[PDB]
Amino acid sequence: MLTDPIADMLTRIRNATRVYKESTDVPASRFKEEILRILAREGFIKGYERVDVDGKPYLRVYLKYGPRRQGPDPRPEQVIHHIRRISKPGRRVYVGVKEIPRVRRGLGIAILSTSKGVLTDREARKLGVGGELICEVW
Amino acid sequence: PTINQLVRKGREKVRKKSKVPALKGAPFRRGVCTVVRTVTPKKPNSALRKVAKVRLTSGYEVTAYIPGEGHNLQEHSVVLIRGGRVKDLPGVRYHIVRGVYDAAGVKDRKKSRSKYGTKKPKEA
RNA sequence: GGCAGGCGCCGAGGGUAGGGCCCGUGACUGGGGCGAAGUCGUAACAAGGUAGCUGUACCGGAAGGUGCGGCUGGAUCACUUUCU
RNA sequence: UGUGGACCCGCCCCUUGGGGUGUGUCCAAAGGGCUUUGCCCGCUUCCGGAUGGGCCCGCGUCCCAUCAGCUAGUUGGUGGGGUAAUGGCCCACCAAGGCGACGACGGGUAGCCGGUCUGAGAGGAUGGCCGGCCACAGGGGCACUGAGACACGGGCCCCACUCCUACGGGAGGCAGCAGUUAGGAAUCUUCCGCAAUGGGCGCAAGCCUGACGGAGCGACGCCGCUUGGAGGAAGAAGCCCUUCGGGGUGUAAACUCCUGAACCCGGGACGAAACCCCCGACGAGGGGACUGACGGUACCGGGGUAAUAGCGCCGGCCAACUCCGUGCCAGCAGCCGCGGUAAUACGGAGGGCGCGAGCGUUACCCGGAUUCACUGGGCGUAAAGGGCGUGUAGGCGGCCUGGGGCGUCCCAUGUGAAAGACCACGGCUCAACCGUGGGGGAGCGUGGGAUACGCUCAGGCUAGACGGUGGGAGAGGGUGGUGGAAUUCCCGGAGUAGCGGUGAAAUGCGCAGAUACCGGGAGGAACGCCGAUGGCGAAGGCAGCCACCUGGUCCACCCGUGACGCUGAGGCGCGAAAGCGUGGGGAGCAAACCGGAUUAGAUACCCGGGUAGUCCACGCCCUAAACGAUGCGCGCUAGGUCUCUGGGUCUCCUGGGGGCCGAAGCUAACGC
Numbered sequence A: 001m002l003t004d005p006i007a008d009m010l011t012r013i014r015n016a017t018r019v020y021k022e023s024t025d026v027p028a029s030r031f032k033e034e035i036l037r038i039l040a041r042e043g044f045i046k047g048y049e050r051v052d053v054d055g056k057p058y059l060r061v062y063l064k065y066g067p068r069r070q071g072p073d074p075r076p077e078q079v080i081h082h083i084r085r086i087s088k089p090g091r092r093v094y095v096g097v098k099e100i101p102r103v104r105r106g107l108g109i110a111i112l113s114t115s116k117g118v119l120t121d122r123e124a125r126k127l128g129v130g131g132e133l134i135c136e137v138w
Numbered sequence B: 001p002t003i004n005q006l007v008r009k010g011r012e013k014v015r016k017k018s019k020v021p022a023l024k025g026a027p028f029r030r031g032v033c034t035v036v037r038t039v040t041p042k043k044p045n046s047a048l049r050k051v052a053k054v055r056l057t058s059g060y061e062v063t064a065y066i067p068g069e070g071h072n073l074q075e076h077s078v079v080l081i082r083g084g085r086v087k088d089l090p091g092v093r094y095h096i097v098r099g100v101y102d103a104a105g106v107k108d109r110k111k112s113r114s115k116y117g118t119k120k121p122k123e124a
Numbered sequence C: 001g002g003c004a005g006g007c008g009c010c011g012a013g014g015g016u017a018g019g020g021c022c023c024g025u026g027a028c029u030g031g032g033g034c035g036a037a038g039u040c041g042u043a044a045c046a047a048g049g050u051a052g053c054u055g056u057a058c059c060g061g062a063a064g065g066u067g068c069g070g071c072u073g074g075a076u077c078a079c080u081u082u083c084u
Numbered sequence D: 001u002g003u004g005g006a007c008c009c010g011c012c013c014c015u016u017g018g019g020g021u022g023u024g025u026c027c028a029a030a031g032g033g034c035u036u037u038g039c040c041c042g043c044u045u046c047c048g049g050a051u052g053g054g055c056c057c058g059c060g061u062c063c064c065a066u067c068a069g070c071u072a073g074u075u076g077g078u079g080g081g082g083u084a085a086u087g088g089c090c091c092a093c094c095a096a097g098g099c100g101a102c103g104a105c106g107g108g109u110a111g112c113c114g115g116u117c118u119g120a121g122a123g124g125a126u127g128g129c130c131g132g133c134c135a136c137a138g139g140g141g142c143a144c145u146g147a148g149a150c151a152c153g154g155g156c157c158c159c160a161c162u163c164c165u166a167c168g169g170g171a172g173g174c175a176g177c178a179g180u181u182a183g184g185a186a187u188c189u190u191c192c193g194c195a196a197u198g199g200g201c202g203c204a205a206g207c208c209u210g211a212c213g214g215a216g217c218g219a220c221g222c223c224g225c226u227u228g229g230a231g232g233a234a235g236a237a238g239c240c241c242u243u244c245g246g247g248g249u250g251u252a253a254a255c256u257c258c259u260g261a262a263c264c265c266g267g268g269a270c271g272a273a274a275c276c277c278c279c280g281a282c283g284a285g286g287g288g289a290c291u292g293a294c295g296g297u298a299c300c301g302g303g304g305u306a307a308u309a310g311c312g313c314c315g316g317c318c319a320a321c322u323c324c325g326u327g328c329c330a331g332c333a334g335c336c337g338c339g340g341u342a343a344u345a346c347g348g349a350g351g352g353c354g355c356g357a358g359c360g361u362u363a364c365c366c367g368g369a370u371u372c373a374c375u376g377g378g379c380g381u382a383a384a385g386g387g388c389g390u391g392u393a394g395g396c397g398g399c400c401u402g403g404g405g406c407g408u409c410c411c412a413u414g415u416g417a418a419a420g421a422c423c424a425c426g427g428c429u430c431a432a433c434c435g436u437g438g439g440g441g442a443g444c445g446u447g448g449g450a451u452a453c454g455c456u457c458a459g460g461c462u463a464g465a466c467g468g469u470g471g472g473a474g475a476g477g478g479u480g481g482u483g484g485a486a487u488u489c490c491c492g493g494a495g496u497a498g499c500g501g502u503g504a505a506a507u508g509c510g511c512a513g514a515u516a517c518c519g520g521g522a523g524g525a526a527c528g529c530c531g532a533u534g535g536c537g538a539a540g541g542c543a544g545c546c547a548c549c550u551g552g553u554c555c556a557c558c559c560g561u562g563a564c565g566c567u568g569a570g571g572c573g574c575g576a577a578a579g580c581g582u583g584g585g586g587a588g589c590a591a592a593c594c595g596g597a598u599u600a601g602a603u604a605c606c607c608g609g610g611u612a613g614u615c616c617a618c619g620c621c622c623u624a625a626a627c628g629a630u631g632c633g634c635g636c637u638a639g640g641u642c643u644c645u646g647g648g649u650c651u652c653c654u655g656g657g658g659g660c661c662g663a664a665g666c667u668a669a670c671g672c
């Protein structure tokens, strides 16, 4: 049993990107889904999809990297350089609309669950809500 | 440690050990010389260092050092002390203030006079 | 009916019997830490000249030795000669 | 007298003792003064307000667990007492409760706060002026008076201390202002005034006020200010260097001119206009009079003198180098370090650096120190993984739906006094200081709203976990039994001069016949080969063979249950060796010990003996280099290869386990 499934996904992703996979399966959940939707909108992932690895439902996430580079070590630049869980179980982290993080001076997002749904830092600022700071990505 | 651990125990604030129990907190303490002695220094230093076992108003018998060219202290000299490691003499942790009570200002000094407590020499 | 007065409970503190706690002093005695050039050896570092460390147990001026078991944090295809 | 109010009973609304109501009872009062029938000051009762308070509650408030149990008015109930009022506040009777690992009980320390210092912040430290609350008045109790006290300059009593005393008996209480003394490194005048502001009484005149407004002392702090300004040599003298040519102090000085702190002279404040009195009405309004401690101070004007500079530092950190002196001395030193005859580190000098009416020292707090890490650290070898398990509380918890809305989020609102902090304008010539305004603020209360996540309740699911069926490998554990090799001992045979041991030897054993060899017996302990590069176990640890009794595990099927999970303080159990107890056993081996050697010595290493012990049962002990020096669980992230053990279509696939090399990556490196 996975202790935190949001973090297992943020990670699965991070591990995949770091070896430049094409895509990767994370087991399905509306919430995980709700998050990836945002990753797509902001362009951190090409897309997601509801594949079905042997009977049980997964989310094929498709990754997006940079172009090839010149020099020793061509490996392209990650589009997701950094993706970290802010609120973890046994240390939940809620912020009010007044103290929602400015991530990398905004060259990056923070994803927070609110009573108005899963939103980005700029999305919650407009709507005027806080919630549970789930992760920053930049 | 886990957050929950830091919840159950906590962190632990630190504690300062005074390098000078001149009690009362006080910046100086008065005492009476009971021994004017001489002490051999250590490690890579040889000489003959001036020292005074001093019985303090704080009810403490501590050995204090006697800075300066030369002194005038005797086994009943009332003296005022002030804290300061003498690096060489281990276990000597305070200095005797020079120019207060029985201990006299270093004679014929021109340079660093406030330490050593010797008045401005006159001139006209 | 009041007052004075009287008795009683409670009651500060005191006494006696026994306890627990903290501070001072202390004849004796235990080891510690410091301090250029005092004494004995030479245990450890090189296979430190008996590989070392180790828990335990006895023994020894002293480091230490030996028993039992453990560890590698042991040198190399073949010996015993303290110190500075 | 009853406006009204209190109380008992009843009814009404309300909802705790709130408000109404009807009988019955009960409860009022004070007089004074006048420019005397008409007002002023008082009095009585009731309702309301304002201010000030009591009590109760939620949450917050340091260290020690080397304090783990605590409680008998204790915990609750009924009735009473008490109070302004609730209440074990107190009392009687009854019940047997109450509190604690979310730290009771105990011990230590401490007034709390607004604030203060520091810090990028989060934090850390502090509670000194000022303001708020609390508590105290020589130490301990206690009530009385009263709206209020358990009462600093009221009372009573006991205690300790001082002073009077005619011996019986009395008098005191500066933690009020000054002041003395003691202690200490250290902390002020026995000052002026009630002019202002404030308080008590008074109708007022006024009285009282060590509150207070001022002054005094101390560089204790902050701010402001002076010790001059402009000219002035290729550049005095003295002092110091030097390559003997010079270079430095140095425009510094002298000197020229200019301004004019100090000092003198004259003017001289603001703070003060009310109370009072007159007109009007004793109201609104207008008129008048009095009053200044600070103080002849501040400020203004005239006159006018070139008029205090110290202190620390100069090896690096760290701004500033040269001579002499000293010789591991004398000494310096925050840390590193300087000094042993050429010292930029000691002492002086010249020179230089930094601050400057101050400059240093010591002490303490925060900082740097992500050096207790929430922000923001670590544990293979640097300090750090518990010896291993089982499991309690606790923490944490897969996928789908619905309810609630506890956490969380949002809006509105109340609160967050003043001072301080921020910003602006303003007052003292500036600032320090001060005035007015503005702004911000964590937290908590109330009304409303959201539901993604977390919580909760109600269903559902099968991917986690567990079970069924069928197979498998294993030194996993316990009890019994049994096998051979060897050592020692005993009995017999044969046999004779040594054996044994070491570098070499010697103790030692052997003519009571050893050693070597054959045959028989006893016993105790260990299990060669197989066997390791292997297996099993949670760890310790497990190895001849057989049987019995037991534990874990792995594969296939995809059958059952339906989140039943993970970890785990404490608890419980296990736990090499040595060690301990009782009993047994005792071959070999062997601490101590007894000898022989070796050595300078030899309490050692080498040799010959040898007890405990090593063995078995039962009961303790609880340690370790208990090691992978690497907690357990789950997910993710190239591959190659060797090996143990399952399964399937078996050149190859697919599990579980044990090694090696290596992708990414990590690491202080080693390495992983």
Ligand SMILES: NC[C@@H]1O[C@H](O[C@H]2[C@@H](O)[C@H](O[C@@H]3[C@@H](O)[C@H](N)C[C@H](N)[C@H]3O[C@H]3O[C@H](CO)[C@@H](O)[C@H](O)[C@H]3N)O[C@@H]2CO)[C@H](N)[C@@H](O)[C@@H]1O
Residues within 6 Å of the ligand: C035, C038
């Ligand atoms: N501080 C030393 C500690 O005490 C012991 O060491 C202590 C003694 O054993 C040692 O003695 C030594 C001696 O071994 C050596 N051979 C001679 C030397 N003079 C001595 O030294 C001692 O004494 C002299 C005066 O006599 C002092 O000047 C010196 O400072 C001091 N260390 O001096 C030490 C005390 O200063 C422990 N063995 C040692 O492990 C431990 O570190």
Ligand SMILES: [Mg+2]
Residues within 6 Å of the ligand: B112
């Ligand atoms: Mg000096």
Ligand SMILES: [Mg+2]
Residues within 6 Å of the ligand: none
């Ligand atoms: Mg009476």
Ligand SMILES: [Mg+2]
Residues within 6 Å of the ligand: C042, C043, C048
């Ligand atoms: Mg040696």
Ligand SMILES: [Mg+2]
Residues within 6 Å of the ligand: C051, C052
């Ligand atoms: Mg070695």
Ligand SMILES: [Mg+2]
Residues within 6 Å of the ligand: none
């Ligand atoms: Mg002994």
Ligand SMILES: [Mg+2]
Residues within 6 Å of the ligand: none
């Ligand atoms: Mg030892």
Ligand SMILES: [Mg+2]
Residues within 6 Å of the ligand: C059, C065, C066
């Ligand atoms: Mg021995």
Ligand SMILES: [Mg+2]
Residues within 6 Å of the ligand: none
């Ligand atoms: Mg050994």
Ligand SMILES: [Mg+2]
Residues within 6 Å of the ligand: none
């Ligand atoms: Mg080590």
Ligand SMILES: [Mg+2]
Residues within 6 Å of the ligand: D002
């Ligand atoms: Mg009536």
Ligand SMILES: [Mg+2]
Residues within 6 Å of the ligand: D015
């Ligand atoms: Mg009622």
Ligand SMILES: [Mg+2]
Residues within 6 Å of the ligand: none
């Ligand atoms: Mg009524």
Ligand SMILES: [Mg+2]
Residues within 6 Å of the ligand: none
């Ligand atoms: Mg009535």
Ligand SMILES: [Mg+2]
Residues within 6 Å of the ligand: none
């Ligand atoms: Mg009457």
Ligand SMILES: [Mg+2]
Residues within 6 Å of the ligand: none
């Ligand atoms: Mg009258």
